[PDB]
Enzyme design. Structure first.
Site, PDB file in Angstrom:
ATOM      1  N   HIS A 121       0.800  -1.204   0.000  1.00 33.50           N
ATOM      2  CA  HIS A 121       0.000   0.000   0.000  1.00 33.50           C
ATOM      3  C   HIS A 121       0.852   1.282   0.000  1.00 33.50           C
ATOM      4  O   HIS A 121       1.915   1.356   0.655  1.00 33.50           O
ATOM      5  CB  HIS A 121      -0.950   0.007   1.216  1.00 33.50           C
ATOM      6  CG  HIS A 121      -0.238   0.066   2.535  1.00 33.50           C
ATOM      7  ND1 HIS A 121       0.337  -1.062   3.097  1.00 33.50           N
ATOM      8  CD2 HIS A 121      -0.059   1.105   3.373  1.00 33.50           C
ATOM      9  CE1 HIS A 121       0.869  -0.667   4.241  1.00 33.50           C
ATOM     10  NE2 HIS A 121       0.666   0.624   4.444  1.00 33.50           N
ATOM     11  N   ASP A 122       0.357   2.302  -0.733  1.00 31.47           N
ATOM     12  CA  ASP A 122       0.975   3.629  -0.830  1.00 31.47           C
ATOM     13  C   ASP A 122       2.360   3.660  -1.524  1.00 31.47           C
ATOM     14  O   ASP A 122       3.052   4.670  -1.446  1.00 31.47           O
ATOM     15  CB  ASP A 122       1.059   4.292   0.556  1.00 31.47           C
ATOM     16  CG  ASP A 122      -0.229   4.375   1.356  1.00 31.47           C
ATOM     17  OD1 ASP A 122      -1.267   3.970   0.844  1.00 31.47           O
ATOM     18  OD2 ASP A 122      -0.189   4.879   2.478  1.00 31.47           O
ATOM     19  N   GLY A 139       5.564  -1.191   2.020  1.00 29.52           N
ATOM     20  CA  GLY A 139       4.558  -0.141   1.959  1.00 29.52           C
ATOM     21  C   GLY A 139       5.233   1.202   1.953  1.00 29.52           C
ATOM     22  O   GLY A 139       6.366   1.323   2.432  1.00 29.52           O
TER      23      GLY A 139
END
Ligand SMILES: N#Cc1ccc(CN(Cc2nnc(O)o2)C(=O)CSc2ccccc2Cl)cc1
Ligand SMILES: N#Cc1ccc(CN(Cc2nnc(O)o2)C(=O)CSc2ccccc2Cl)cc1
Ligand SMILES: N#Cc1ccc(CN(Cc2nnc(O)o2)C(=O)CSc2ccccc2Cl)cc1
Ligand SMILES: [Cl-]
Ligand SMILES: [Cl-]
Ligand SMILES: [Cl-]
Ligand SMILES: [Cl-]
Ligand SMILES: [Cl-]
Ligand SMILES: [Cl-]
Ligand SMILES: [Cl-]
Ligand SMILES: [Cl-]
Ligand SMILES: [Cl-]
Ligand SMILES: [Cl-]
Ligand SMILES: [Cl-]
Ligand SMILES: [Cl-]
Ligand SMILES: [Cl-]
Ligand SMILES: [Cl-]
Lengths: 258, 258, 258
Positions: A121-122, A139
């Protein structure tokens, strides 16, 4: 045979450009947008809100657009954006990122994401990157253009991988990798610069010469990061490639790999 | 939308609670038992004899309940037992264990087993554990409560991972990890204790203080394991948290990670 | 119950023996050839030109016969050949190799390729090998008979893994592994000889003694590779298994793992 295989599941809210191919037993979930000339293989799981660009290739057993674990609240809008001309190989896992805080998971163009690679994520991947088999970005990882992460490279959250940098197979990266730098081992250690990649890109002899000198300033002359940054200022103002190297050291929030 | 997808295969000997959800192209094999509130995603392979409890979620491309590789004789009864409120992410592989010699593969409650993690035959996972992506337990591995194994942690057969312990990413664990201990590298080495986790779990400052002193007795004071266990006796009788640490060093069959 | 599941896809150009079993949602692609007694599980992707021999077992989520990146020109003939009595576990990836230059990817007989292992283009595996979970052969890797590569062993392109050799879990092999040698770590280091393997194969006490003697000549007696090969000439002439050890050092192109 139909471009969209009848054995695939396409959510009514998904938006696919007219020439998109989807293989059998693939799922194209709600809020998934797929651009022109994209080929989705069989047994692919696509979850949204996800935007996939043009001329992409996504292979079997991949899960693209998986949930963000970070969520500040239930129902916080998330997104995954993939550019054009990317190859996402089999078993790849790509998680979405949060919209509000401009932390969406984003992938640029002409990237090659090899078998069972993981994009947490991100994370933000630029253009022309190669993430070899089982490379994993925990991440909030930023991978700049032309980076090469060899098989089974592990990247700690918040790390930045500099443009044209290289990691050896099985590298465990806990710190930022400056642009062009070659890193190896668990924990990762700086070895040299990817001069081979500079020549392939068509860097001038003078830019390569200034980069080789730049590496010594940072790693071989006992300078602090603060001292190294001041010593590189002159060369960086003259060579854009040296400014790329200096900027990556300047923007290092987790220190540089040494 | 039907709870059991019409594209799923449910063996006539499988036993399911009425509200179990099974996704398209999933196989619920012979002798698989699934409890209330469990959700099986699409493309999942379940093999038995397996019991999956309540409120579990099993993602796509997972193979749960695979064969034990080293039976004493052909047809020797085996079993996998999964508890409640577990999350098994995509591509996870879990093998069954032998019933006879009480070596079944067992997973307790509230565990998180992330993408492509592997749970080898006869392994025992407690409660509230996190096995990050591609963590691999070779076989006969005991993971006590609240352990966190970071991405790509490899665990040698017969190793014991203590309660509230932590492995860094890419750790190759060949010996026992005492409770609370943080381990890193290939080969794994002891660094400290997970004081952060102790605080999140609400441990008193006195228990944390006694555990910090306990780590020094074992690792920083040139004592033998026998000498350390004798010096820890007084503290262990007083703090249950120190007894948890002491017991993990006492029950170590492969020596402790140093 | 139909041998070819009606939910599988068999390309009209594929050639199968009459008793071949194909599970649901599996693809036997164009130019795939499958021999007598072979069992293809569900969710398998087979791509050609590929030959799969007799009595093989291929598990779910495997991608066997994938494209070779190493292509002189578009349409260049490629091939993957798999022998008999092999077991290819779940999620395994195997790439084809080029025909013209005798660099096809080949797998012999009685091999065990465990979950998520990767066999890169132009790799050659002999007989009775074991590639444990997530072992990755980058490409052009030669694995001789009875070799065991423990979980997550990574192998650099062009490396040779000798007969009866062993790698510890998480090994990163960059150089050749002589026959019988045990290697560990990232980067891999030579430790001893695989005496357990020698005992399992019923080697004579004289052969096990001559091999232990051979290891010391090469690694623990301060000799160069040229000095070691000359001292080995006598023992290699008397014992065929010492000749196996001598031949693997003689044929090393990337130097020997030390
Ligand atoms: N397109 C491309 C591409 C591929 C790899 C690299 C970098 N690279 C060396 C190499 N170059 N060609 C091949 O096949 O390998 C590795 O990552 C080796 S490790 C490895 C390699 C492959 C699978 C599993 C593992 Cl572990 C660079 C570019
Ligand atoms: N739920 C949770 C959860 C997740 C990870 C950890 C431990 N952890 C640090 C971390 N915390 N949040 C994130 O995303 O990572 C790692 O394992 C890093 S390595 C890694 C991480 C993710 C994928 C591949 C790899 Cl290799 C602890 C708890
Ligand atoms: N058939 C067989 C076979 C299996 C393993 C080995 C070698 N081996 C030790 C061992 N022996 N039996 C078991 O289960 O493990 C390892 O690779 C351990 S690491 C590992 C193990 C399993 C999964 C993931 C990982 Cl990381 C040798 C032969
Ligand atoms: Cl790939
Ligand atoms: Cl994530
Ligand atoms: Cl490398
Ligand atoms: Cl239940
Ligand atoms: Cl996950
Ligand atoms: Cl197992
Ligand atoms: Cl870590
Ligand atoms: Cl620590
Ligand atoms: Cl704290
Ligand atoms: Cl045949
Ligand atoms: Cl392919
Ligand atoms: Cl396996
Ligand atoms: Cl390949
Ligand atoms: Cl090992």
């Amino acid at each position: 045979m139909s471009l969209i295989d009848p054995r695939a599941i396409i959510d009514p809210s998904a938006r696919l450009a007219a020439d998109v191919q989807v293989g059998p037993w693939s799922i194209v979930g709600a809020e998934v947008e797929i651009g022109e000339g994209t080929v989705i293989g069989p047994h692919v799981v696509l979850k949204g809100p996800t935007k996939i660009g043009k001329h992409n290739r996504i292979y079997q057993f991949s899960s693209v657009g998986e949930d963000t674990p970070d969520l500040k609240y239930k129902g916080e809008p998330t997104r995954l954006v993939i550019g054009d001309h990317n190859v996402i190989r089999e078993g790849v896992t790509i998680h979405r990122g949060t919209v509000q805080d401009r932390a969406e998971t984003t992938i640029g163009d002409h990237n090659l994401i090899m078998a069972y690679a993981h994009i947490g994520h991100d994370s933000v991947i630029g253009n022309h990157c190669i993430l070899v088999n089982n490379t994993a970005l925990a991440g909030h990882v930023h991978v700049d253009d032309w980076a090469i992460l060899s098989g089974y490279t592990l990247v700690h959250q918040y790390c930045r991988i500099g443009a044209h940098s290289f990691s050896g197979m099985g590298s465990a990266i806990g710190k930022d990798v400056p642009a062009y730098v070659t890193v190896f081992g668990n924990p990762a250690e700086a070895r040299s610069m990817n001069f081979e990649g500079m020549r392939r890109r068509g860097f001038s002899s003078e830019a390569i010469h200034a980069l080789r000198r730049a590496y010594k300033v940072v790693y071989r002359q006992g300078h602090t990061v603060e001292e190294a940054l001041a010593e590189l200022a002159e060369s960086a103002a003259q060579f854009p490639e040296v400014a790329v190297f200096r900027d990556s050291i300047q923007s290092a929030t987790r220190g540089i790999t040494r």
